[PDB]
Design a protein around this nucleic acid. Sequence first.
RNA 1: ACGGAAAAAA
RNA 2: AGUAGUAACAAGAUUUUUUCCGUCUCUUCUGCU
Lengths: 249, 743, 708
Amino acid sequence: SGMERIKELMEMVKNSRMREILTTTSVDHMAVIKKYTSGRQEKNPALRMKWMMAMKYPISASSRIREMIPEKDEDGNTLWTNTKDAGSNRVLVSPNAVTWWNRAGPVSDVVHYPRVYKMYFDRLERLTHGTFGPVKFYNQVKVRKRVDINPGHKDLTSREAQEVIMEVVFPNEVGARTLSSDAQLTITKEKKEELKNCKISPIMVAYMLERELVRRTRFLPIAGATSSTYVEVLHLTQGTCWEQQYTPG
Amino acid sequence: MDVNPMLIFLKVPVQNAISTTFPYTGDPPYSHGTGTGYTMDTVIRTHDYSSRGIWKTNSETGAQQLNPIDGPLPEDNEPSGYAQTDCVLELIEGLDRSHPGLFETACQETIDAIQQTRVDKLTQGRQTYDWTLNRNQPAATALANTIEVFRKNGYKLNESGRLIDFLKDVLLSFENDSMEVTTHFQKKKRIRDNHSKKMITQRTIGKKRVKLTKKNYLIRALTLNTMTKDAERGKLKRRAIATPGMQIRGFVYFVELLARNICERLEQSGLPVGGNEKKAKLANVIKKMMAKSTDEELSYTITGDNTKWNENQNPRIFLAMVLRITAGQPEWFRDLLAVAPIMFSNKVARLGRGYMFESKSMHLRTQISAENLSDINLRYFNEDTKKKIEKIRHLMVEGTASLSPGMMMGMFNMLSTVLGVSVLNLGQREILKRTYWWDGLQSSDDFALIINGHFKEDIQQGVNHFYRTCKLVGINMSQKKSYINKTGTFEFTSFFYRYGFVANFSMELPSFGVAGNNESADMSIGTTVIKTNMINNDLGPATAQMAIQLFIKDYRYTYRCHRGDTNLETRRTKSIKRLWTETISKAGLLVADGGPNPYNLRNLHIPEVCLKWSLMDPDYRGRLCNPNNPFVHHMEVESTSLEYDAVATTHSWTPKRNRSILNTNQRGILEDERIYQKCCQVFEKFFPSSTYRRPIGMASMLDAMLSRARIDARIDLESGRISSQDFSEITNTCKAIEALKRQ
Amino acid sequence: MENFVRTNFNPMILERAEKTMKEYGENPQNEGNKFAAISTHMEVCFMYSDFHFIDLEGNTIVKENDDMLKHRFEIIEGQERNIAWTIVNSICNMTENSKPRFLPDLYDYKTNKFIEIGVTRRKVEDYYYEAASKLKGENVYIHIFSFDGEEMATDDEYILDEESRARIKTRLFVLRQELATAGLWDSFRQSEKTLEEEFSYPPTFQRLANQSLPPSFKDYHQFKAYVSSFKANGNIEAKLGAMSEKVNAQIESFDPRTIRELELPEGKFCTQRSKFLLMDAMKLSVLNPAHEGEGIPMKDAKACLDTFWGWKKATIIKKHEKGVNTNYLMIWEQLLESIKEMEGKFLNLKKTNHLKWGLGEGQAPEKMDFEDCKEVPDLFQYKSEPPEKRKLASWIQSEFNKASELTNSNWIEFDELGNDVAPIEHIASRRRNFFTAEVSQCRASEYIMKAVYINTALLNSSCTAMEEYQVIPIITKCRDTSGQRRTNLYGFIIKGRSHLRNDTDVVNFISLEFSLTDPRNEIHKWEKYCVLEIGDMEIRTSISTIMKPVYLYVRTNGTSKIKMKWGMEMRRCLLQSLQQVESMIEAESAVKEKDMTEPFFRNRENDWPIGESPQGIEKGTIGKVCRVLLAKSVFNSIYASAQLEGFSAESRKLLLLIQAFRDNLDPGTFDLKGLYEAIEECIINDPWVLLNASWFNSFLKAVQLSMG
RNA sequence: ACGGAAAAAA
RNA sequence: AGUAGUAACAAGAUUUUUUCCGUCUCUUCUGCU
Ligand SMILES: [Mg+2]
Ligand SMILES: [Mg+2]
């Protein structure tokens, strides 16, 4: 099975320049060459998106889209064109192609958005089943305190949660770092049972477990409760002269 | 009636309407042309506030160097840079005495972090002067070029991965009599344009390799390149910023790390805190200082700015501060932290890219570089530039100006904060034993001073004492911009305290609008910016609703995604109209797909695809969140073709990237980036965590990939995933790759 | 030593030992016996792991060469540390074996056990019990060999065969005899037993270090010893006694009844520099436009031009003094002729000589490199002169008075919101409806939408039509009080040749705007303009139907991508007004403990001072205050300049000094004359900066009258 | 961990 | 001419701290009720 990447490595080591680079650069030096660039880095993207959507082809998708969508819409809109190049791997794409995929593309049965972004669905279910009280008007004595914008796991700190995520998602690249805690192993086995035969990317699973398990803390002006369900609705519950009485679900 | 908006200050206090004093709705002032004149202004202002010092010729670079410290005392209120060494050492000694065990823990944290820091910590700066090319580059490519020119000249200590070994190579590279670099050139060729029939010059960029001299390499290593700061608010005239090379970039990180560990534990330092944590720390020390004033005592706050900060911060004073903070530490640590003030006391400033010269007879304009302004007759410049060149000509060594006194802007922020906090720490009522005493707050140069005393004469005595003690160390308080009132209102780093820090929404106006990445990312950016300004900067709820409406209007115009029942017409109105007419539950269509606006004050913390998920059609949510969607990138499943699914919607697409320059052929300099990206793309086939976390190791990439291939083939053989012929094929291909790397 | 290890070992063993020594940062030259011990450990692990193969059935067979077979052991020692831990993690996540705390040496697949192999020079039992004390807690198989011809495994149960262990013992006895005959045995036997860091200075950097000191010192180590051996003997007071008395911060007391006004500069009157006519603009409107092609700018332009048919021949009424005015007249005639017969969506104009002059084509000198410009005897520098000073005129105060006024058209239409569920959302909706009732019909909203349309269409034409001369009509769309749409045309913009690559590159354009204002009444406002007289209009007032001449203001202007970007984002001005105004509405709501939105808006009491009259200070309501702050933000965005940034930043300190005086906080300055010179430096020629300076002087006089 | 945006201070 | 302001365009090649967001990848079009 792993003969394909080994033949890719042999083909890339047959060339003398890539062999010189792969034999002289270390694993530590690869970060110095992964961020290497020589062209002019494009700045001010807001203005470029202002004038670039006036162009007919502002999106550069992969070449496989030439087999996924037609070249013309029902109204005759040219959805994609080739690039003026003697190669492959890129095509210029109209936003009518995005609307065509959203109105006439293949309907999937499996979607991964309720699972990967389940924290925002939890916040939506807290907001929907909430309870609003009356508005009191008085001078808010707001004190900037450190509060949890993400609660995390109750049995894990930030470092222990990141160690649990590294043991779950990327277990053969953890180095000589073993989790000493005993809830780390239980949460690791629970997540490994939950994430077997996973069809999504490993970094997507790692970021899902990062927004689930790792707690984040910020300094925010708090007038009232400091629980993690009240920091997420801090813009709604308080202002400068008013207080919204809110109870989550 | 003549309308006057200032008269609202007759009823409303000024700090309660200070957002009207910030004109942050128009374009900030940009700088045209070259930063040569501002660089020569900085050099002349540095050597004119220090002109009574000792001039010496450097034995290594041949440059004229000014030594103004321990010089004559200042005799006027002008900005002077004659800092006394013993006063600086007494202030640092009193700072160590009033904070017991402060320098030891900071030096020990720097000891622990020096052993653990790697070379790619230097790929964190924004841009970097590349001495190999004499050009500004990003930090990663400048570090890569420095490492390649070092290890192609025998300096191969940086192959160990540590930053301190790269710094040993940096210090040892000054011994080479002929450093051989990899420069760039161009080939101009007059080819006609095929759309205007006008003769252009197709300059083609290519790689050249030439040898330097020892003095030329030492000039290029101590060179601070210069440019002009753009889009700066609050200033009528522009100024030059500078960037150091890759030799000085390494030691500056360690000195800044030490001074940051010091500045984190000082109660008077406004660095490195920011935002609401800085405001809470500032308010806590104001509450602590106002509770020290007795029932019969006067307290007065100075809002203070310092005039010409970097023109008077001498690097030898910072050398004394580094050697006094690190007293008791091992000598290698003191030398490693002391390299950077030595490299900044011997620095040269690159003078930009010359000027532009206009022949009125031939109707010509030409960019004359800064290295060519020495053999030009002075009749061609204007009078300001002629005065600047006549004042700067005796400092020019190899196209750069000598800048031994003073600093450039933003170099040592934390160490200067340490010096200012030491001056603030002098005036305790137990150290002084006088009638006046002070405390305060210190940024890089901005400060707020609180002087308590029994009478206003004692307040004036304390102000004079603080001013003259700042003058002893080269800190010149701006008398034009500092002002003193009673305690209760002041300003510090554009934070206005009027019995509590008042809000300022006008400073956060350019963060509104469509950010310009894609559809869903800009929706999240807009709603999070409105929510953040509701929380922090006190954006009111009705103005927040109007900000939601203005963002939705600008977002619907920007991505041409107006509502499906509109009468407007764009390039994508027919597809959005078809999607609007064929959708049963139209309240689940996204704004990027011509749906309604779902946002209000209660749901700014919820993304758009989540908030509309209960209202989406099954067909629409199947097509929108399709895992086979082609607009995003899919990763291939590794050995542990078949690609992974996609979670993002169809609105997380990639916009087109333009990188071509006018008449420029850059296929010689981009092929290195292409081969580097090929090697980094094939490395992740064997190590899938190299994008989540940075991989470590001292072995090469090829040895790591062959070892991972062999151990994965053996695990797949012994676990029952592959066959024996697969294992034999992988091991024989690894043997063939080893035989290719041998011979 | 070192050469014995380079003689009596295989070169691959030396390569593995060198790669494992360089991982710790120690050369074999500084430690030769450690290099010999590492090479001996490597060779013993290699002789343990080699020539042991597992067949297809599973039985471990010993082969003489590598004849399809797999190795029995996995070698862990000799690799990199991260490579070895990757191998250990791959093994431990295939079986159920717990991870070893330390790196082992081999791994036997036949018994599934990690193997630690130590090669000692003491007795084997001593190093065995030392390793068992070091590895107490984990199940790692140990196998210690020594140079004494004896071994010791764990529980004396050897898993390797007898022949390979006999070869190991014979090789170690050969190495012991070779170390005896080289006189190196007891040195290597007593070579056992972390290092420190070091950072020395090379002589070039030492000579740089000697020249980076205070001028009394000549060596870096001398200054280092001085700083390490320094105690304070009162150096600060000793230096303060020697400093002159003329270095002091003498607090002069601040009183705004004693300070002076700002000195506005003296010269010619300030000129209109906006991108369009603000108060003088006359629009041609269509009410409910239902023509074929509604939405397209040129179709709406022609449909608005069809509403006015009083086109007489255009004559130059007010000349541009520095420019050829017949070129402007021919530009307008070419524009009208090309409008009256065209097809398509866009109108690109023919590049005629008068239009080339008006758009500045060919005015740039040709750019060459200095290598091809070496014998040019006329190369003089660019002129970097400061701007000329200008005097304040009354037209900018007239513009700001007209820009705060209500009109009969809803100029800004806000998009829909979500459902209001929370009670604070209903409160904010009521306050937002009050804000939109007071703010949408303002002249500043018309200027916002005019600037947004002009900068958007100018940016699109600049980025898609870089060569052609695009005609961009000045179109806005509004809704009157009847609830019906209206499309207004203010004139046209002929775009230049916009090949802008830098951020500050200027695209020139020509603005031709319709108006009814005579340029001879206030001619100093119109220096940069050429004004024609293009028509006559029957203006019908309440009494008379008069024939007012319709003029056309033609001028050459220019912009850049940054100015167009900040022109497109002018609707955030609506934030900067209303967030201020709501905060005042919030402030009283903290004192009255109720919702003070409706008492502020409905109960019109004229609470806030917003005007100066010949009578005195005039007061208006909160809606007038919101319109005034909206017009202030609009004029800050339109007339943005570095002079405005400098003036606002420097006058903020004087406003804060006046506020500190009014709080009875006893304000004091150190150099008020220098602060006044810093404020008055930024008042040069911008009309908005001059108007804000006059506003500051009027506010100063109002403060001085308020303390009497 | 990479990249982008805004602000502050020189 | 004009933009503009200490110097450029008028075609020819991003220094330090904090906050927030995102994640693997090179042609003829200008329409904000
Ligand atoms: Mg200040
Ligand atoms: Mg300053």
